[PDB]
C-alpha cells in the first residue's frame, strides 16, 4: 500500500479537500490593539499584513499558500515553511516545504530541521522554519494520520479490487472442474487452458468447453449475495471519516443530520466547534508564537473571520438586526459596515 | 481508460456542468474604493472592467470565457490563459490554453510555463500566463482530480458495460458446454458453433437440441438477482460526486436534505458555504494578485454578486424589506435600486 | 445507435421539450437606459425590438424562433443563425441553420463558419452568423451533449428491447431439447423447428410437439424476476436527466420534492437557479455581444421577464402587495400596472 | 403499428383530451389598446372578435373549433386551417385541414403548403393557411410526437395483448406435448390435435388424458407471478405521459403531489407554468403574427383569461378581496364586476 | 364484444351516471343583459326559458332531458335532438334522437343529418337538429369514446369471466389424468367422461374415480397466486376511468385524495376544473350558437349555477359572509337572497 493509492479513495480526497479549502476561504485579519483594549484592523501597508493577506512570496496567492500548508498539516500531521526576513529582522517571504523530506532532530538543548533535498541536507534552526506541528504526544511533532489509517484503507482497497474484478469477469462464477475416472490424454487436459483465456473477458457465453467425459462441474465463489459486498462498502466511509473527524452527512451517508440541529446555522456551528476550530487556533497561535516579535505581543494580534460560516438566512439576519434596534447594540453605520453599505447620519 | 470515456459518465458530466455554469452565471463587478472605504462600481469605459465584463477577446463573451476556464480548473485542477497587454502595458486580451498541453517547471529560482503547441514546445513567464492554480500540496500546481478519480470511475464503467451486455445477450446466462461422453470429428466440433453461439439473439427458442451422445450442459452466471447489481450502481454515484464535493440530492439522487433547513435559501447557503465559495475566492484573488497592478491594490477591487443565489421567496423578501424600512437600515431609494424601480423623495 | 433513436427516449424528449419551451414562453423586453440609470422599455417601432419581439423573418413567430434555436443549443451544444442587415448595418432578418451541417474553422487570426449545404460550402464570417455556443472547454464551441449521452442511452435502448420482446413472445420461455442417444431422422430434426415458428409468435399453447423420443427438456431464460427488469428501468431516467440537469420530480420519479421547499414558488426558484438561469444569460449576453452596436452598449439592454415563473398564489401575492402599502415601496398605479388594471389617482 | 391502435391507449386518450379541452374551455378576448396603454375589451360587432368568439365558420362553435385545432397540434405537432377573407381582405372564415394530408415545402425562397385532398394535390400560400406550427428544430414545422412515441407505445400494446390472452386461455400455461418413443400415424397426430390442444379453451377441466406411451408433458410459461407483470403496466403510463408532459397524478396514477404545495391553486399554477402555458403563447402569438394586420399591431391584442384556473376557495378569495379593499388596490365596483354584481357608489 | 356488455362494467356505469347526473342537477338560468351590462334573470313567461327550465316537450322533465342528452354525449361523443318551432320561428319543442341511428353527411357546401329510423331515412338540415358534438379532430363530430375503450374493456371482461368461472367450478384445479403404460378398453376409459363432469360441477367431493391402472395425476391451473387476479383487477379501474377523466378517489380507489386539497371545497374545485367544466361550456355555447336568434346575441345569455357544488361548510360560509360585512361587498338583502330569507331594511 502507498500514500497515493490511499489518496485515490474518494472519502479521503473529500475530507482533505473540504477542511483545507474551508480554512483557506476564511478572511484573515490583523489588528493593532490599543492600551484601552480597542482593536484597529491594520492595512496592506504593514509588512506582515501584506505578507499574510496579499502575497507570501513571488509565486503564490495568500489563499493558495494557506490551503497548501493545511493539506500537509492534515495529511502528515505536520507542515513546514522556509521563513525569510530583511536586515531589520522583519519577515519578507514564506515558502512551503514537502513534509516527507523533513526530519527534526534535537542537538543538545537545540533543534535542527534536517531537510533532505534529494541527496543534500539543508539544516535549519527554529528561527527560519515555521513548522505548524499538529496533534501528538511529544509536543515536538504531530502524528501523521495517513500512517495510522493504513489498515482500514487496506480493507477498503481490498474490497474495491474484489468488486471490480467480479464485474470485470462478467460475473462468470469460478468453477470446480469436478470430474470422474476416465483416462484423459494430456491434450484433453490441455484443452482446459488451451481453448480459453476468455472466461474472464470475452463473450464465449454459451460455449465454455468440456471433453468427451460429461463431468459434474460447479461454482466455487460465494456470490455478492453476500450482502457485505454492499453493506461493508458503506461501513468503511465512517472508518475513514473518523481519522479526520468529519460529520458523515457532509460526506454523503444516510440523508441529513437527523436530530442534532434544524437550520443551516446549527450545522455550521456544530461543524465549527467539533471539527474546524482546532486549525484556527493552530494557525493563530503559531503566528503569535513565532512570527510576531516578543515586544509586539499583546499589541499585535490576528484573527480569522467566522461570519462567512455563521451567516444565517435573510429572515434570521433581519430579525437579528431588528433586535439590535432597541437595545441599541449597534448604530445603523456599524450594521451598514457589515455589508459595505454607504454610511448615513446616525 | 481515458478522460472522454470518464466524462461520458452522467454524474461527472453533471458535476462539471453545474459548478462551471453556476459560477459563470454570477454577476462580476469591480469597485474603485475611496480612502474612507466607500465603494464606487466602475464603468465599461475602464479597460479592465470592459475586459472582464464585456469582452475577454475578439472570439468570446465574458460568461463564455469564465465557463471554459472553470471547466478546466475543475477537470484538471489547473487552468491557463495567455495574457496580452498594450504598449502602455495594460491588459487587452485573454485566451484559454489546454491544461493537458501545459506544464509548469521551476528553472533556477525562476519558473517556466512549457506549453506543448501541437509539435512545438513553447515557453512562457509568470508575466504572461494567468494560471488559476487549484488545490495541491506544492502551492505551485493543483492535483488533477481526474487522475485520482480513475479507479472508482473504472469500477463504474466496468459495471455499466457488464450491465448492458447481459440484455444484449437476451438475458440468457453463460453455459458450460460439455462435448458429451465420446470424441467427435473437428467438423462435428465446428458444428457445435453452427448449432449454437447465436443464443445472444432472440429467435433460437427451441433448437437447443442436445446431440445423441449424453451431454451435461448448465449455467455458470450468478444472475443480476445477486445482492450487488442494482444497489451497486446507486452507491458509485456518491463516489464520483465526492471528487467534486456536490451534495447528491442536487445530483438528482434518492432523497433531499431532511435535517439542515428545508427552505430553498438554506439549500443555497449550504451549497455556497460547502461547495461554491472556494472558486469565488480563487477568481477574485487571482485577479487581485496578477492583473490589478500593485499601486492600485486596495483602491481597485473585483467581486462577484451573491444575491442571484441568496434570493428568497416573495413572503420572506417582503418581510425582510419591511424590517429594513422600519429600523431604517435602508432608504426606499436603495431598496428600489435593488429591483431597478424609479427613485422617489427619501 | 443514432440521434433519432436516442430522441425516441421519453425522458430525452421531455427534457428538451421542457427547457426550450419554457425559455420560449418568457417575455423578452428591450430597454433604453438613461444616463441617470433609469430603464425605459422600448416599442415595436425600434428595428431590433421588432425583429426580436414581433418577427425574426418572413416565415416565423418570435416564440417559435427562440424555441427552435434553443433545441439545437441543448441537443448539439450549439445553434447557428444567418444574420441579415440593411445598408445602414442594422439587422433585418434572422434565420436558423442546422447545426449538424455547420463547421467552424480558424483561418490565421480569423474564423470561418463553413456551412455544408448538401455538397456546397457556404462560408461565413463572425459578422453574419450568430452562434449561441454552449458549455465547452475551448470557448470556440459547446460540447454536443448527445455525443456523450450515447452510452447510457445504449443501455436504455438495450433494456427496452428485451422488455418488449419477452412479452412479444408471450413469455414462452426458451428450452433445451434433450434425450441422450436415439437416432433422430433428418425429418424429425426438421420438424423440431419446421413444425413451429409460432413458438415465438402465435397460440400453440397446450401443444408444442415432441418427435418420437419422449424428451427431458429444460429452460434457459432468467425471468424478469431479474430485479433490473424493474429497478433498472426506473434508475436509467436519472442517468439521462443528468445530461440536462433537470430535477427528476419534474420528470416523474418517486412522487414530489420531499425536503427541498414547500410551496410552488420554492420549486420554481430552485428550477430557475439550478437549471434554467444559464440559458437566460447565454441569450442576453449573446445579444449584447454581437447584435447591439458597440456605441449603444450600456444605453441599450435586453431582459427576459421572470415573473411568469416567480408568480406565487393569490394569498401570498395579496400579502406581498399589502406589505408594500406601508413601507410605500409602490404606488397603487405601479401595482395596477403589474396586472394591467386602469390607473387611478395616487 | 398505427395511430388509431395507439390512440386506443387510455393514457394517450386522456392526455390529449385533457390539454385540448382545458385550453378550449378558457375564455378568449380581444383588447383594443390606447397609446397610454389602457385596455378596452372589444365587442361582437368587431369582425375579428366575432370570428374568434361567436363563429369561426357556418358549421362550428368557437370552443369546438379551438378544441379540434389543438387536438391536431398535440397529436401531429402541427395543425392547419384554410383561411378565408372578404372583398375588403378581412378574414371571415376558418376551416380545419388534416395534418396527415398536409405537407409544407420550401419552393425557391417561397413556401408551399401541399395538401393531399383525397386523390388531388392542392397547393397554398402562407397568405391562406394559418399553420399553428409546434415544437421543432427547423422553426418551419413541428416534430410529430406520435412518430417518436411509437416504440414505448409498442411496448405498451405488446403487454396489453399478452395480458388479455392469458385470461382468454383460461389462465393455463403453455405446454410441451411429449408422448414417448412410438412412431405416430398422421391420424394419431390428428388425435393429439383433437383429443388434446383443445385444453386452452374454457370447460374441459375433468379428463386431460395420457396414452400408454407414458408421456412427459410440462409447462414453458413463466407465470405472471414474475416480478414484472403488474409493475410493468404502471411504469409504462409514465413513459407515454412524458411525450405530452402531464403530471401523472392528474393522469390518475398512484399518489398526488406531496412536496410542491398542497392547495388546489398550487396544483393549477404547477400545471399552468410547466404544461399549459406554451399553447396559450402559440395561439395568441399566431393570431398576432398572421391575422392581426401590421398597422393594428400594438393597438389590437388577443388574450385568454386565466382566472377560471387560478380560482381560489371561498376563504382565500374573501381574504384576498379584503386585502385589496383595505390598501385600496380596488374599488368595490371593480370587485363586483368580477362576479357580475350590480355596481354601487365607490 | 358489444356496447351493453361494456356498459355492464361497474366503473363505466358509475362514470356515465356521475357526470350526466351532476350536470343535470345544476340550476340553469337565462338572462337578459342590459346595455349598461347588468344581468336580469328571466321568468317562465319567456318561451325559451320555459322550454329549458320547465318543459322541453309533452313527455319529459327538464332535468330528465339534460341527463338523457348528456348520456349520449359521453357515450357516443355526440347527441342529437329534433328541434321544433312556431310560425314566428321561436322554438317550442325538443326531442332526443338515438345517436347510433344518426349519420351526418355533407352535400356540396350543405350538411344533412341522415337519420336511419328503422329502414327509413329521415333527412334534416342544421336548422332542425341540435347536435351537441363532443371532442374530435374534424369539428364535424366527436370521437365515440366507447369505440376506443373497447380493448381495455376486452381485458377487463376477460379477467371477470375467468374470475367467475374459477369459483363457479368450486376452485377445483383442472387435471392431467396421468398414468403409465397399462392397457384398458376404450369402454372402460370412456367412463371418465360418463362418470364425472362434477370436477367442473359441484357436489361429488370424494369419488372422482380412476379406471384400474393406478394413475399418477397432476394439475394445470396456475392459481390466483397469480397476483394479477387481484392487483390487475384493481389496475383496470384506472384504465377505464381515463376514458372519462374521473378522479379515481370519487370512483373507489386506495382511500381518499392524499395530497391535492384538504376540505371538500378543494375536491369540488378540482373536479369542476379538471373534469366537469367542458360540458358546461358545450351546453352554454351550443345554446348561444343555435337556439338564441342572431339579433338577440349579447342581449340574451344562459348560465349554469355552480354554487350547489362550490358550497363550503357552515363555518367557512359564515366567515365568508362576515368578511363581506366590512368591505361592504354585499348588503344583508343580497346575502338573504342567497338563502331565500325575507328581505330586511338595509
Author numbering:
A (entry chain F), B (entry chain G), C (entry chain H), D (entry chain I), E (entry chain J): 52 to 397
The paper states:
We have determined the portal vertex structure of the bacteriophage HK97 procapsid, where the scaffold is a domain of the major capsid protein. The mcp gene 5 encodes a 103-residue N-terminal scaffolding domain (mcpN) and a 281-residue C-terminal domain (mcpC) that exhibits the HK97-fold including a triangular A-domain; a P-domain, composed of a long spine α helix; an adjacent three-stranded β sheet; the flexible E-loop; and the N-arm.
The asymmetric reconstruction of the portal vertex shows that the portal and surrounding capsomer density were equally well defined, indicating that the portal and the five surrounding hexons have a unique mutual orientation. The towers were readily modeled as trimeric coiled coils consistent with residues 2 to 66 from mcpN and accounted for all 30 scaffold domains around the portal. Thus, the scaffolding domains adopt a pseudo-12-fold organization, buffering the 12 to 5 symmetry mismatch at this special vertex. Cross sections along the portal axis showed that the portal/mcp interaction is mediated by mcpN, including some of the surrounding S76 to S88 α helix but primarily by the flexible spacers and coiled coils that adhere to the portal’s 12-fold symmetry. Our model of the portal, despite lacking 50 N-terminal residues that are not visible in the density map, revealed several contacts with the scaffold that occur in a groove between the wing domains of two portal subunits in Fig. 6B. We observed that only one of the three coiled-coil helices interacts in this groove where it is surrounded by a polar distribution of charges: lysines (156, 160, 161, and 346) from one portal subunit and aspartates (94, 135, 141, and 169) from the other. We show that no less than 30 mcpN domains interact directly with the portal.
